[PDB]
Design a protein around this ligand. Structure first.
Ligand code: SF4
Lengths: 356, 89, 77, 167, 305, 146, 167, 94, 110
């Protein structure tokens, strides 16, 4: 039972974490995940900062998809103050949020395919960041979410590049879909892990790909009527093969479902930039409001107890992947050191929203 | 031509590996000493084939055979030592 | 006990200075002017050529003169 | 208020020795090869630009360093002790970054932890900023003539036992 | 005269393999600049001098002779077997009656250097890594020497210059690509897989000149495996379908080793790690029985010859 | 490359204000700084990419102004000068001069570069080692445009 | 010439001090690597003995196959314990007197005078000259019976090593 | 006779003196118990001796007819029967 | 794990078996490594004064459990003592390292 140190510079690059295991032989049997490495103290500083000052702070959580964090932390005060967002800016927010979900799943499967290369996905990623530069102007550090919608307007080149992104992107996606059917090393090196079912993934804490891996059509934005999700084409992954390749088909189907949503929303266009802007500064109320949104990892959440002041009295975040990190102590029991790379890939986690 | 000195080196190995085979704490040091003894006899056969028997390489053929049996002896002796290492706690 | 050649000088030294002087600037020039205009068959054979033709490039490695003018500019330094 | 150096002479004043020093310094300024050290928001520049933690002396700290990160970081600098230095490529390796006031478990720069040559603007710049940073560092090492191999150990210690109370 | 004419093929061969390992470094950099998108030629010598001019970095462990000679034996286990390559009909270093057999011995003394590296480092990381590297050098030796044996059985000779001549009788089809492509696949997977390249450290206390020794030892392992790809299957100097024959034959065999460098680095970048279980599943239950199988096939086939 | 001549040292001891026209092609710039350092001199660094009012920063004890993060006061203290404290940063007597290595030729203002070159003429031990807007070769043109 | 027999004496001194490193060192790991040095010198002696297939066979089989498993079992340290293993007065006595008999046997024997005799069976039959071919013709069909026997020996060695080493 | 490997001794001398000289010019100028891999090496050692036997036969098979063919055919039959034994038992198991 | 220290600039706890500069294994011998980066002058008599002051501070500040919080407190007020010693001119700077960042601010004309 030689204790692994599981150091800060991992052989893989998926964050800094601590997974000391007794490993009797090569079989890992007992996990003790030590965290606190990439920690900032978001809650106390968010109690010490306003919404327009913790609004630059929402970038250090799920920075592979930064639209979700600022999206839920601006959708908090919109439903809190009951201020209506017009349909145009809300649908463009839906388009860019699904594009960030696309970016999150491809930036998962990039380094996951690198561990188990970079320019096989970067040919797409250069045009993806060109879309981010034509949408807001930054690469992943955007500050463009207001109460009335997008802080700016879409330029006349970004809608043309958004029309071109579908037949720029879906063809290389379906050229990348056949690899797992062709290449048997993904049928023999990541096949098998992920043995949890649906009645158990509901039982512990799970959401996102680990909950849709068992063949459950789970969606917050389908159950909760949000952003007119029943107008668009939906196909939530009811893939019941359980394992890690079931999760890969889950993520391919989620990317293709977002492609279908954006492709139906290419020519929608139902309406200004910011509705209800009389003054630059405002405040918040005091309610008992827990707002959540469909994360790419499953139910990102914002807890809020107001102060009727410039600062929020309570600001607690429920990150999706940190609740999804609880299941590995149970998914460690009968695997190998060559398996834990596939495990910490298939969790689909970065340490930005973990410690926070 | 000092070339008969390699026989003296052979006898040096044949005495030192035998001394290490008598006084040995564990088993694997004595097994390595046994292998040095097989080396002493082995280089003796190679030297005698070099000196006398070069049409037939009978000493060198026996060198191949004695290094084969040295390999088999070392393999089974380490198998015994490893089975002891399994059977202790 | 053959000595089939019986040449004292200027047999392989001429070929050595030929291969070490005439070849490497034309080889490096073909590496420059065909950096993008290539099939992967052409990049394959150019990689095989630059692998075969390595140690002549030692006198041409630090020196670099006709390399950078993608305009019609003036030396305004 | 500073100290005084020795500054006697330059003993290696031949043409061959200064030629070898210039060539070894320019080749030392040519071969960066970082051990990457990402695992933060500055890891994103690695895909656009080893594993033995005693090998690559020319590492740049491209990560958000905290107080719990600090013992492993100074141990890793102990694993790169004599030859080369580090480059701060984050506002949090310089001033603590955006949390420079009120963060308890984040050090206000590694400028109180490790010798730093070059300070960056910080939050992920363009991928040619790291190229300009290693070019500057190459100009810095080109100024260095390997200090004419001039060496001093302090060795401050008490052999009196502390008033200990372990668990 | 009594030592100059003897020393200068050794000196020219050491300079040639230094240029070849420079080629392998910058050629993996060129394939990474093709798949990942002048001064760069001397950047590899800058890498060598960065790894050369450094600190000794010796910890407090008392294995200083083994700490010294660990990476040294790891270098010797490749460098001593460059006396083996018939680049043409001439300019081989020795006559070498046992041609490839000495290469199998010197490549088999490489796990001695791997275990000396695993003990020279006072770290459980490099201890486990030296165990793994020595075990995969052990494990991949048997189908390696099996396909070596099958090619030498086709030729009925062990000396490399004889088998290099022997491949040129039928012509272009007389090469061992069309005689043993199965054993060629065996030699491909044994060449790529043994050097910790096609699957995958253990240098966590070796630094300074010792890290450079492991560096040059790994890439010279790639060099000598590539040159045996040339002198076994592709041919030495024959393109059938004085002084100039040597100069064109060295170009032929360098084009062939550049071919295998491009194939090997491309196959490295398009295949991941075998995750250490399919590695041994290959080399013991699959690769060794099929190496014995085509050994039996070439044993049955040389009855009529 | 590597043209063996110390004519840049003759320029820095004759004119002491030369625009170092040299690319971003690695560290081919500090070798003459290393030859000035091996001559017994001491060389320190500056950059004009964020240096404003350069004569008011090299002398006249420009203010410290510590950046409080919304917690401390203004505390308008006077930091010591750049090159006056650098002349105060020569403890032995064998140091013949002080080299001011400047590595930003852009965002420099031609007038202020002439003001900084005149400030290199103010102290006799001051050497201006400014950049030269990144030419392809290594050119050491003097301060003629500034 | 003199380089040959001086290389012989150098190999002799290095091999005897490596063998005393096998016998009389506190570390069994140090003894095993001194064994590896000894067997490299043995292979060099067999190169000196004009038996080159023998040399590289002993280099292939006896550090590449033997000493790997030796150092495997040595780093996996197990346990400790009239010709018998009873020392400090017996093995020194019989070691010195058998050493004296062997020194008076080798040194006091005109070996080259015996090389002058039995010279007819080493006249090296002219139609072949190559060493490995001659090993193969004297090994495959001349000593066919032990060649067929070591197949059975190594078969039983593998089968017994499986049936013992697993348990 | 010191002609086949006469250049090889000098090759050994240069290659053996160069790492220690590199160490001099670099010094002047600046508890597991896993025995599965053990079991792999334990199968390896006897298969390696059998390859050593297979080496000079295939060197010298050309001068001999079908007799040496059936000699080493019985030999490799013993080899592959040991290999099938290694399959069917708990030998490799990885 | 095994490292139990609060190591900053000029203050390193390093409670290990370190008589000489060879690290090990870990014990109650707190080996105060000072100035790793060659930042100040650090004359030997002033180093002895600072080491004696740190010995008196760890003697009077113990009695509680010597866990990591006491290590943070003792390294922090040791750095305060070094700052107030260099501000009074007992510790000059170095100007022999490749940075010389003047980590405690430039001394004024006051
Ligand atoms: S300064 Fe900001 S972006 Fe840079 S490493 Fe620190 S937290 Fe990340």
């Amino acid at each position: 039972l030689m204790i692994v140190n599981m150091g800060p510079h991992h052989p893989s690059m998926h964050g800094v974490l601590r997974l000391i295991v007794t490993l009797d032989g090569e079989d890992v049997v007992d996990c003790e995940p030590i965290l606190g490495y990439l920690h900032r103290g978001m809650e106390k500083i968010a109690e010490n900062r306003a919404i327009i000052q913790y609004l630059p702070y929402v970038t250090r959580w799920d920075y592979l998809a930064t639209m979700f964090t600022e999206a839920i932390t601006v959708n908090g005060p919109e439903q809190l103050g009951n201020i209506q967002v017009p349909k145009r800016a809300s649908y463009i927010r839906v388009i860019m949020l699904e594009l960030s979900r696309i970016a999150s799943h491809l930036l998962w499967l990039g380094p996951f395919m690198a561990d188990i290369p970079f320019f096989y996905i970067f040919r797409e990623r250069e045009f993806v960041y060109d879309l981010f530069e034509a949408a807001t102007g930054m690469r992943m550090m955007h500050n463009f979410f207001r109460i009335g919608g997008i802080a700016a307007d879409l330029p006349y080149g970004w809608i043309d590049k958004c029309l071109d992104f579908c037949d720029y992107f879906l063809t290389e996606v379906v050229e990348y879909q056949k690899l797992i059917t062709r290449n048997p090393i993904f049928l023999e090196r990541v096949e098998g892990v992920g043995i949890i079912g649906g009645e158990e993934a509901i039982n512990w804490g799970l959401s996102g790909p680990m909950l849709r891996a068992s063949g459950i059509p789970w969606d917050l934005r389908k159950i909760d009527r949000y952003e007119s999700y029943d107008e668009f084409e939906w196909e939530i992954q009811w893939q019941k093969q359980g394992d890690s390749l079931a999760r890969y088909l889950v993520r391919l189907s989620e990317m293709t479902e977002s492609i279908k949503i954006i492709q139906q929303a290419l020519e929608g266009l139902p309406y200004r930039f910011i509705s209800k802007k009389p003054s630059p500064t405002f405040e918040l109320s005091k309610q008992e409001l827990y707002v959540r949104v469909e994360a790419p990892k499953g139910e990102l959440g914002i807890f809020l107890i107001g102060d009727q002041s410039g600062f929020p009295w309570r600001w607690k975040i429920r990150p999706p992947g940190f609740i999804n990190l609880q299941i590995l102590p149970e998914l460690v029991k009968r695997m190998k050191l060559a398996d834990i790379m596939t495990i910490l890939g298939s969790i689909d986690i970065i340490m930005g929203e973990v410690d926070r | 031509m000092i070339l008969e000195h390699v026989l003296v080196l052979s006898a040096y190995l044949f005495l030192i590996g035998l001394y290490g085979l008598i006084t040995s704490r564990n088993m694997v040091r004595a097994l390595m000493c046994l292998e040095l003894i097989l080396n002493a006899v082995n280089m003796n056969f190679v030297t005698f084939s070099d000196f006398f028997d070069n049409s037939q390489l009978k000493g060198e053929i026996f060198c191949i055979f004695v290094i084969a049996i040295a390999a088999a002896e070392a393999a089974i002796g380490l198998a015994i030592v490893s089975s002891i290492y399994r059977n202790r706690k | 006990n053959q000595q089939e050649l019986s040449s004292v000088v200027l047999d392989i030294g001429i070929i050595s200075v030929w291969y070490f002087l005439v070849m490497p600037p034309i080889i490096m020039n073909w590496l420059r002017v065909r950096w993008y205009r290539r099939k992967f068959f052409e990049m394959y054979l150019q990689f095989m050529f630059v692998f075969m033709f390595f140690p002549g490039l030692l006198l041409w490695a630090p020196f670099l003169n006709f390399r950078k003018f993608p305009r019609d500019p003036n030396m305004k330094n | 208020s500073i100290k005084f150096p020795i500054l006697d002479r330059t003993t290696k004043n031949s043409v061959i020795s200064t030629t070898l020093n210039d060539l070894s310094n320019w080749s030392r300024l040519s071969s960066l090869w970082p051990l990457l050290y990402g695992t933060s928001c500055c890891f994103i520049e690695f895909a656009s630009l080893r594993s033995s933690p005693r090998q690559a002396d020319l590492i740049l700290t491209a990560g958000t360093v905290t107080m719990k990160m600090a013992p492993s970081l100074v141990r890793l600098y102990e694993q790169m002790p004599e030859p080369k230095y580090v480059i701060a490529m984050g506002a949090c390796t310089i001033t603590g970054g955006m949390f420079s006031t009120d963060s308890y478990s984040t050090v206000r720069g590694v400028d109180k932890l490790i010798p730093v040559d070059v300070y960056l603007p910080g939050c992920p710049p363009k991928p040619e900023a790291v190229i300009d940073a290693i070019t500057k560092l190459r100009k810095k090492i080109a100024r260095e003539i390997y200090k004419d191999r001039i060496r001093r150990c302090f060795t401050t210690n008490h052999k009196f036992f502390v008033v200990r109370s372990p668990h | 005269y009594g030592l100059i004419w003897i020393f200068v093929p050794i000196f020219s061969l050491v300079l040639g393999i230094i240029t070849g390992v420079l080629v392998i470094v910058w050629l993996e950099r060129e394939i990474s600049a093709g798949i990942q998108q002048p001064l760069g030629i001397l950047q590899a010598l800058a890498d060598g001098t960065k790894l050369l001019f450094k600190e000794n970095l010796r910890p407090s462990r008392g294995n200083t002779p083994l700490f010294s000679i660990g990476p040294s034996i790891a270098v010797i286990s490749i460098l001593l077997s460059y006396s083996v390559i018939p680049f043409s009909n001439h300019l081989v270093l020795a006559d070498l009656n046992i041609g490839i057999f000495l290469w199998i011995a010197i490549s088999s003394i490489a796990p001695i250097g791997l275990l000396m590296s695993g003990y020279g480092s006072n770290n459980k990381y490099s201890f486990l890594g030296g165990l793994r590297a020595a075990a995969q050098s052990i494990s991949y030796e048997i189908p390696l020497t099996l396909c070596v044996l099958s090619i030498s059985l086709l030729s009925n000779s062990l000396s490399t210059v004889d088998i290099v001549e022997a491949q040129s009788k039928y012509g272009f089809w007389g090469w061992n690509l069309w005689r043993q492509p199965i054993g060629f696949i065996i030699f491909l997977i044994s060449s790529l897989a043994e050097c910790e390249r096609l699957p995958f450290g253990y240098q966590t206390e070796y630094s300074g000149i010792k890290f450079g020794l492991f560096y040059v030892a790994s890439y010279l392992n790639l060099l000598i495996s590539s040159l045996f790809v040339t002198v076994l299957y592709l041919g030495g100097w024959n393109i059938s379908i004085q002084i100039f024959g040597t100069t064109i034959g060295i170009f032929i065999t360098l084009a062939k080793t550049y071919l295998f460098l491009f194939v090997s680095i491309a196959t490295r970048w398009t295949l991941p790690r075998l995750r250490m279980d399919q590695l041994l599943n290959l080399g013991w239950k699959f690769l060794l029985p099929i190496s014995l199988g085509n050994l039996l096939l070439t044993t049955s086939f040389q009855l009529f010859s | 490359v590597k043209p063996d001549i110390g004519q840049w040292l003759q320029d820095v001891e004759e004119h002491k204000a030369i625009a170092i026209y040299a690319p971003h092609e690695g560290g081919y710039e500090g070798r003459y700084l290393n030859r000035l350092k091996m001559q017994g001199y001491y060389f320190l660094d500056i950059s004009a990419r964020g240096l404003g009012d350069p004569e008011t920063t090299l002398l006249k004890n420009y203010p410290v102004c510590p950046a409080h993060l919304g917690k401390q006061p203004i505390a308008r203290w006077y930091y010591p000068p750049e090159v006056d404290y650098r002349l105060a940063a020569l403890p032995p007597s064998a140091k013949g001069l002080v080299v001011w290595v400047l590595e930003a030729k852009v965002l420099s203002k031609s007038e202020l570069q002439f003001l900084a070159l005149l400030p290199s003429l103010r102290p006799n031990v001051r050497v201006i080692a400014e950049c030269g807007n990144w030419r392809k070769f290594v050119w050491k043109p003097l301060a003629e445009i500034a | 010439g003199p380089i040959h027999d001086f290389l012989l004496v150098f190999l002799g001194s290095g091999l005897l001090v490596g063998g005393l490193g096998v016998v009389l060192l506190p570390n069994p790991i140090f003894s095993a690597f001194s064994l590896g040095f000894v067997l490299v010198c043995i292979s060099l002696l067999y190169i000196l003995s004009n038996s080159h297939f023998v040399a590289a066979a002993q280099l292939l089989i006896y550090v590449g196959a033997i000493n790997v498993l030796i150092i495997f079992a040595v780093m996996f340290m197990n346990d400790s314990e009239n010709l018998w293993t009873i020392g400090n007065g017996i093995t020194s006595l019989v070691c010195t007197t058998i050493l004296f008999l062997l020194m008076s046997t080798i040194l006091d024997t005109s070996w080259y005078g015996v090389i002058w005799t039995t010279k007819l069976n080493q006249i090296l039959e002219q139609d072949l000259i190559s060493n490995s071919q001659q090993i193969g013709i004297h090994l495959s069909t001349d000593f066919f019976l032990p060649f067929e026997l070591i197949s059975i020996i190594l078969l039983v060695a593998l089968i017994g090593a499986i049936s013992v080493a697993r348990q | 006779l010191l002609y086949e490997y006469d250049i090889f001794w000098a090759f050994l001398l240069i290659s053996s003196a160069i790492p220690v000289l590199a160490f001099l010019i670099s010094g002047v100028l600046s508890l597991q118990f896993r025995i599965r891999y053990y079991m792999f090496a334990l199968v390896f050692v006897v298969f390696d001796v059998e390859t050593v036997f297979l080496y000079p036969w295939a060197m010298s098979f050309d001068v001999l007819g079908v007799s040496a063919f059936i000699e080493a055919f019985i030999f490799v039959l013993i080899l592959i029967l040991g290999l099938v034994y290694a399959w069917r038992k708990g030998a490799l198991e990885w | 794990g095994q490292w139990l220290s609060s190591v900053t600039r000029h203050v390193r706890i390093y409670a290990a078996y370190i008589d000489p500069e060879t690290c090990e294994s870990q014990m109650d011998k707190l080996t105060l490594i000072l100035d790793p980066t060659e930042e100040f002058v650090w004359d030997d008599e002033s180093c002895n004064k600072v080491y004696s002051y740190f010995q008196e501070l760890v003697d009077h500040y113990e009695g509680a459990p010597l866990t990591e919080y006491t290590l943070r407190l003792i390294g922090s007020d040791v750095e305060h003592y070094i700052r107030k010693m260099l501000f009074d001119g007992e510790i000059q700077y170095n100007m022999d390292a490749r940075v010389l960042n003047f980590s405690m601010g430039k001394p004024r004309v006051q």
